[PDB]
Design a protein around this ligand. Sequence first.
Ligand code: 1KS
Ligand code: 1KS
Ligand code: OLA
Ligand code: OLA
Lengths: 450, 454
Amino acid sequence: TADLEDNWETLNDNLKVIEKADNAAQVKDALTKMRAAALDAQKATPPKLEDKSPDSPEMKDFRHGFDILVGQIDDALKLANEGKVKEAQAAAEQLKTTRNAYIQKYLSGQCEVPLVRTDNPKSWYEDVEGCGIQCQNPLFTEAEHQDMHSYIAAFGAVTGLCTLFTLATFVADWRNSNRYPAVILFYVNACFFVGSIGWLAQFMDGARREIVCRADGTMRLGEPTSNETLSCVIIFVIVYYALMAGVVWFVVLTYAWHTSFKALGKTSYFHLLTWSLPFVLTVAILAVAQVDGDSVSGICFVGYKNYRYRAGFVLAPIGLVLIVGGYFLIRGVMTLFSIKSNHPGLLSEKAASKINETMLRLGIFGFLAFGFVLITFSCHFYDFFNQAEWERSFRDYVLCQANDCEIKNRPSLLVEKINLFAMFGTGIAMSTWVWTKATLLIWRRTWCRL
Amino acid sequence: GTADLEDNWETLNDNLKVIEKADNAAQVKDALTKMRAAALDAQKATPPKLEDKSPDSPEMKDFRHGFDILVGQIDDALKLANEGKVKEAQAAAEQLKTTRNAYIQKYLSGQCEVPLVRTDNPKSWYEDVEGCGIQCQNPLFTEAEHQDMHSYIAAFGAVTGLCTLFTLATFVADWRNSNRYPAVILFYVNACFFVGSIGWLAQFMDGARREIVCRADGTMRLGEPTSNETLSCVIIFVIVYYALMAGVVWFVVLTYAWHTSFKALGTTYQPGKTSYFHLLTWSLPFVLTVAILAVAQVDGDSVSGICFVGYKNYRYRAGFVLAPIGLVLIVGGYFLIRGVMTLFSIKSNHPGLLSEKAASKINETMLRLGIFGFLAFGFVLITFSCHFYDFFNQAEWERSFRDYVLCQANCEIKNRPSLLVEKINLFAMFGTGIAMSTWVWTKATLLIWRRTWC
Ligand SMILES: CN(C(=O)c1ccc(F)cc1C(F)(F)F)C1CCN(c2nnc(-c3ccnn3C)c3ccccc23)CC1
Ligand SMILES: CN(C(=O)c1ccc(F)cc1C(F)(F)F)C1CCN(c2nnc(-c3ccnn3C)c3ccccc23)CC1
Ligand SMILES: CCCCCCCC/C=C\CCCCCCCC(=O)O
Ligand SMILES: CCCCCCCC/C=C\CCCCCCCC(=O)O
């Protein structure tokens, strides 16, 4: 009925009355007028969002900020009706916080897209006071975000269910399956399963915004931070630790294949050699606070803002597992070449058929993992080689939108999809370790246990 | 001086401008000659900033010394100009711009005020103070405090180098019999402390400290690997950081060997032996070192005389030094406690086995491996406590450093790092090297060297 600008001024005016009021009747009346102006403001469409759908995320977030505000006005009203003026004034002072962190960005004029109005100085973009970078990655369209989300949902669900089956198959036969070198594939699978949970957490109701955005709607950058939720650092820890634990268990896989010949139980502190390196690296990223959120990937990761951190903590360790894993695979084929030439009557003897089965299967999984890890490496390499320029194009676009503006260059979502194909694909390929006639018997034995 | 200091300074600049722009090889030799004279008259002068100062004061002595290195570099450039090497004479003349700006300009009327120094390298400019960079010598510590630290590092580093080199030599002299677990773990620990000692001692070579810790423009090394700077800083960092990180991981292996060697006597557990934990021990420090180089957080420090991680930004020291050492204390500590539990269990379940009557060689090796492992834990813990003090206080020190530096542009130092905490760190760090090197101080070593003495 009334204009949004007037409704906003009614909120300002009545807030002044509450703080300089001596009685709860003046507070009650000011809050009642605020509740009316908040609800009517909720019905209005911000001037910036006239081209936007009423069911669009910007409009839904706009309306949500007033839902929080109306609840807080109602909380202040039960206090005022209790004759608690001091407490009602205190609750009313919290309306300023909500108005400024959630709604203000839709009533500004001070900031221009992709910048967003926020009173939080820790959220401000470089030297621009009062404005922070919007949570939604400004270099990619809503259509490119949604296409990417459907892509992660699909690949993430498939990897999650495949790896979960392999884990369930292993624990069902844990007495007979927890034996080296077979149990290496159990931990490889656990790594990609936990990793998938990390990638899939964004698909829960309102989870992507909780993970990737700051409470004031700006993008999560340089986490761990003060007065922000733990959702970002949790997703990063799940994704990054599982990713790094996965490439380390891959080296163990190549090592097991390289030593499967010298040999033809063994469950000791092997875990110390595998879980330590991703722990130290994860802890190092948390101490240097280079954890950032991203709306298109829907996760929190390292080196999204500053590419060097992705190069140091993702590219370089994966490059080292490739050269170490590659070494054990080459040495493994040389030993296979040696045993085939020097002793032709080893693979030509049926006496050790169980040795021939496990060694051939180990090598297949070892080389398959290597190929996918090499694709994963190449995509992080393209990103390392080009993100300095992309960061400059990001900053240049964001800045002339304040003072037509073009995006010179941007990250490639295709390269990201290839990386995810190879990353989730390792998880799906490694899960086929349990896709044998022997596991059909394990689930039959599990069914006959009731 | 016959001519004014500001007059001779203008002559020094004008000739330096007609060197890179000079169209004659004779003009290069002519401009270098006129500058040599202009510097010697400027050296005679007393800057108004130091007119209250005695002529034998540290300040006046450093002002004159600046003109000695300036004249000395002209001699290096005049011999190249006389040999017709125009490209080499102009390249050596750019090192004169550094000597003028970084060592002498602070005593004259100029753009910058100590601890800031004139630099034509924009990468060195401190914040919004255009044309000025932070001087290489740490402004928080005096020359005497620096000299006292350098003597301390020299004594501890030379002793740690010689002790570890003796232990490495003894192991390689009897390699067929010495290359055995858990004994050979002490050879790899010693190898880390030896290599690390070379890193710390590199600064004592002639003019090496300045090359390690300073930029070509005379400002301190920060955020290394830095473009168009020498690799001397990152080489020293890699040697010190990698050796430090490998050493504390080889310490975890030591505690592991102690626990599992006892476990192997009492239950189904393989000792130790043909196990390549080498993969973790060399990889974990490699992966950490490459991450630091990729995020370019290596910095130089004149008081330590090395390049290290997180000097400028304490969070990098916390993530790459404090957190890893803390992790080695919980894992190493865990294996030591488990090791004593197993030790008591063997003594209980196998009466008299670990004695001079029964398994005397196992008893003896397990006894000194435990004393070395508990001693090393104590030193690593002292090391951790010192890196923890630094982590807990550097956000303040960084703020005090910035506030002091900017105040001199447009005060007093509120707080600063503790050099005592650093000496205690170096005592326990080098002390581990010296303590772990005594593994070879037995009668059997005398026998090894007598048989090696042909
Ligand atoms: C960083 N990025 C920006 O846009 C951006 C944001 C802020 C900033 F200040 C400056 C910039 C920049 F422009 F870069 F300069 C992008 C974010 C999206 N994008 C992705 N990257 N990686 C992954 C991935 C694959 C495997 N594991 N992971 C984590 C990934 C996975 C799915 C979808 C997209 C992915 C490429 C890099
Ligand atoms: C960082 N430091 C500064 O002064 C400085 C410089 C620039 C800057 F922008 C801000 C600052 C400030 F904010 F002040 F911190 C100091 C450097 C000296 N100092 C040392 N620290 N550590 C070690 C050590 C022990 C074992 N291994 N190692 C590497 C060490 C060893 C010998 C002598 C000194 C050592 C304490 C910290
Ligand atoms: C573009 C070419 C660069 C990539 C090739 C890297 C070459 C590295 C050379 C040899 C690999 C050595 C790796 C060490 C494996 C030792 C493992 C062990 O046996 O314990
Ligand atoms: C006491 C033995 C020290 C040996 C140190 C040498 C090994 C370290 C390797 C490279 C360090 C590079 C620093 C050399 C400085 C160059 C000296 C100069 O020309 O000014």
